[PDB]
Amino acid sequence: ARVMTRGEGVYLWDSEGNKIIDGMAGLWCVNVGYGRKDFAEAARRQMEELPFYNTFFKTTHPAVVELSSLLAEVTPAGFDRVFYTNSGSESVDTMIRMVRRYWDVQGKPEKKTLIGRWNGYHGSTIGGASLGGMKYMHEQGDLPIPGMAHIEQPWWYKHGKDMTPDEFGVVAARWLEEKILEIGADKVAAFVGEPIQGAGGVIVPPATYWPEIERICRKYDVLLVADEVICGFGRTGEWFGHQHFGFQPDLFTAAKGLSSGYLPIGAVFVGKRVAEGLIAGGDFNHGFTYSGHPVCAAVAHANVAALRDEGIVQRVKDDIGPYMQKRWRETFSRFEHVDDVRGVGMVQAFTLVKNKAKRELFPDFGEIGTLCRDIFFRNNLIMRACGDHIVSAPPLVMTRAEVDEMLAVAERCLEEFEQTLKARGLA
Template identity: 75%
Template sequence: MSLAPMVIEARQAVQRTASRRSTREWQALDAAHHLHPFSDAAALNAQGARVISHAEGVYLWDSDGNKIFDGMSGLWCVNIGYGRKELAETAARQMNELAYYNTFFKTTHPQVAELSALLAEVAPEGFNHVFYTNSGSEGNDTVIRMVRHYWASQGQPQRKTIIARENGYHGSTIGGASLGGMTYMHEQGDLPIPGIAHIEQPYWYANGGDLSPEEYGLKAARALEAKILELGAENVAAFIGEPIQGAGGIIIPPSTYWPEIQRICDQYGILLVADEVICGFGRTGEWFGSQYFGIRPHLMTIAKGLSSGYLPIGGVLVHDQVAKVLIEAGDFNHGFTYSGHPVAAAVAAENCVF
């Protein structure tokens, strides 16, 4: 039998049997073949994974018929809820028109151009360019390369170090996990990579002691200045932080924290990067968490709410100050097969009009 009929037969067999499987059968298949993220595989397989079968609005249903309120919005991403037929119809229409083409080789397509213009419209003033990735993790890897290329292009290649925060989360790729400040992640894979430094997180409840929230906010922010002076300002490329730390425990900084961080970045001339992967696209009541806190970043990492999780897409919004240097520097030798994927871009654009 040739390969094509074998594939068709296997697909038909899957379709026939999938609807008849029990929860235990799906759990057994999952345990036999699927390695889950951030999981103790042996413990999970012994217990059996919860099988989510469908969703609508803010509710999930598992394969045993239990209705579950999805308070976490997927993984902080399904911003407009489940079951939005407009997005499904947009994806189907785009797949039939142009399912894929890359944005390498001096090409583009209408969907990525339209989404880029829309993002420039909703982003804070001065953000007129976007570099596309498939996830927030890839976005933060892109940030590392972009800020180092930015400084090297201006004759300051020694400005490589990026300062981040303890217990911050910026993804689980080698670069993203290095930027993040979670020690249990660093213990696997000899992380962080060189050129990453960490300072105290602005967690008043745990670290504030006898200080008021406002006093502690200033203290925590000034740890950045101390680290810059320790490393030498001429060696520091950027500071990165989530407006509100998400995976680290929904840590909302004191009101004095971000204004002082902004002052320090401005004073020492380092780039300020806002990781908006969780806070972006309405989660704080503003389009971006940076706007809620009055932050003026140079780069903003985006993902999750960009498509409300309906398709994988992420990116880095780039302020004109940085974009001008990158454009004039020539080739930026970085990118991904699915950067600006037409179907993901079309769905993201439809999502952003709600």
């Protein structure tokens, strides 16, 4: 069929010469777009010159030292300890072990349960798939493992009932309290959440949600962990998604955001309280000192430098983010089977619905999303279909003109979509 032949900026090309507008590469964290020659050079040099680690060497690799130094400058107050891995899935798994070790060290070994959310996603390790709330992943491996619990997701469109979003955000956060009390606070180690659920369909919680979650976590002496694997490194306009929603996690996980997707890498960023805890047990100290594939760290360093020095993150907050959000809602809000148009910064979405009046979803959630996605692709546009949610997360460097080009095509596709719907009486 059609193979990929080239990537540059926000586009990729196929073997037939088609230019494909990549409206989703940020879900794989390609935040600065394709074709960065300087990143390629950063990798080339490190691979030619240096070893890939070995030991005894009282030192941390110079590529890693530099990356760590730079990250301290761009992360929020209190994150000055970073543990490197090879992926977001590994970062999640390491985080689970850290959270449990922290409580062990505090002399509370029974505090082992982590609480996630249905439709949350935290990667594909046994630990991560257990903490995530995708039912199809739980079946593959008799998951979740012990010390994993789940609460319903803050999806107002489905569960918001007769409530305003804001009233719902309180109710949905209180589900965490209910679960903690059910399990017992002294068996609960942490609550873990993506600031905006990514793979679950860009579920943007109400403004009252995260503050209520945080309040509840502190009330019960439970750690708060953000999974920033999608939302970090400028996706919401802030450097990290938790900054946008105004909560303060005790740890947070990131992945290819570090490298804009150019090479595999992940990290766990550990706040002061937990860091002091772990080091006191002498734990994770070899990881903190020797973690990080130096080639990937070299690319990650060039990337984070670029995001800062080129003003890419600031440009999402001030310029392209507001432009995108306005243009997104302008384009999609009018369609008959489009509802819950949403987004922050450079992540945005809507849901294909049976009936906007009744807030009624299509049956066999996903079938209609697939149809819309298929139309997009026939028209040389990629966006992600998550059930009947259509989601977009383009490179952060996307211009105002590229935004319009993308939305012009998407608009044409929705017009076709609305017609195809009626034409088979699914409307």
